[PDB]
Design a protein around this ligand. Structure first.
Ligand SMILES: CC1=C(/C=C/C(C)=C/C=C/C(C)=C/C=C/C=C(C)/C=C/C=C(C)/C=C/C2=C(C)C(=O)CCC2(C)C)C(C)(C)CCC1=O
Ligand SMILES: [Cl-]
Length: 314
């Protein structure tokens, strides 16, 4: 209950899927062309059984200029531009890309994948063979659960590009209006009646970010999977609005324990769906809350779990 960074250690039994950042670190070592080929290969195979939802109209508008620029290049330049993004080179295209929210980056690559499939953007060279390190990285990806596979792909996409500056322009999709109160569903969690946890889940499912933020302490933090804590209400609300629209949280069961100084620690396990895949991918998730004596959220961590065997009382 003293520091955010120490609260990171609550429920230390929780086995997170650290194969995801492990695999991203291996991927990040590869030659840029192998990075692009590997993801092409993974994307094609995954597409046999899983369809990515179309990017939103606003997103496509925001990425349109950069996409047109690439589409106007000769093939060799197209390949160079894509390598620049993978290498995190400092170029105007790489700076534009870095200014974008994850969803806008994902929609940019969704479009390039379609154009590559159609032959209008320089494809991976015919009969391309991956490097020794890259073939093993793809094998690991293809052995993971779908929820882990899609998190590896997202993390590879978000990592590309070049950030120059701390307070650079941030471009994101418009904020959706919250769900009308009448049509809202309420979660049920075995073992857990805590109103702060239930209101957390219900407000996020409703895209009601202004209500959700009011659950947190001023200095409180949210830790997304495999990322550092996002600290304080302005940064946490920014993150909700830019990155947390249209999720479906399906918590199942939890446990409630005392912590030092009248705090309470609560662990919930269940599933989450991203709007990119709807009901076809359910990620196995734990939430770890540290609530102050008044019930506000001092810390919440969201973990991608190593296997369904990490869900409480499988
Ligand atoms: C790149 C590339 C390509 C294309 C690649 C493409 C098109 C790839 C597309 C990949 C896509 C669309 C991946 C989407 C992943 C979404 C995830 C993991 C969301 C998780 C959300 C969670 C867990 C949120 C949970 C949360 C909960 C529960 C909270 O309680 C609080 C909020 C929080 C957010 C933390 C080509 C194919 C063209 C080849 C070349 C190439 O390189
Ligand atoms: Cl998402």
């Amino acid at each position: 209950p003293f520091t955010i960074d120490s609260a990171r250690g609550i429920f230390p039994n929780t086995l997170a899927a650290d194969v995801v950042p492990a695999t991203i670190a291996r991927f990040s070592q590869l030659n840029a062309e192998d990075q692009l080929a590997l993801i092409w290969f993974a994307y094609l195979e995954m597409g046999k059984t899983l369809t990515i939802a179309a990017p939103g109209a606003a997103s496509m508008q925001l990425a349109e200029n950069a996409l047109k620029e690439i589409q106007a290049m000769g093939p060799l330049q197209q390949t160079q531009a894509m390598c620049d993004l993978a290498n995190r080179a400092d170029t105007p295209l790489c700076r534009t890309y870095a200014s974008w929210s994850p969803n806008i980056k994902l929609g940019f690559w969704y479009r390039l994948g379609e154009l590559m499939e159609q032959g209008f953007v320089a494809p991976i060279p015919a009969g391309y063979q991956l490097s020794a390190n890259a073939n093993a990285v793809l094998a690991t990806i293809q052995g993971l659960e779908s929820g882990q596979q899609i998190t590896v792909l997202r993390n590879a996409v978000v990592d590309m590009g070049f950030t120059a500056g701390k307070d650079g322009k941030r471009i994101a999709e418009p904020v959706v209006p919250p769900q009308d109160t009448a049509s809202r569903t309420k979660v049920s969690i075995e073992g857990v009646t805590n109103a702060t946890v239930l209101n957390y889940m219900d407000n996020l499912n409703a895209n009601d970010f202004d209500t959700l933020i009011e659950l947190f302490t001023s200095d409180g933090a949210l830790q997304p999977p495999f990322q550092r804590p996002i600290v304080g209400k302005e940064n946490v609300l920014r993150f909700f609005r830019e990155e947390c629209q249209n999720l479906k949280l399906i918590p199942e069961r939890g446990v409630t324990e005392p912590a030092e100084d009248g705090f309470t620690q609560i662990k919930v396990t269940g599933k989450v769906q991203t709007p990119w895949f709807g009901g076809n991918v359910g990620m196995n998730i734990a939430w770890r809350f540290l609530l102050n004596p008044e019930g506000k959220i001092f810390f919440v961590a969201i973990d991608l779990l190593a296997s369904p065997k990490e869900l409480l009382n499988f």
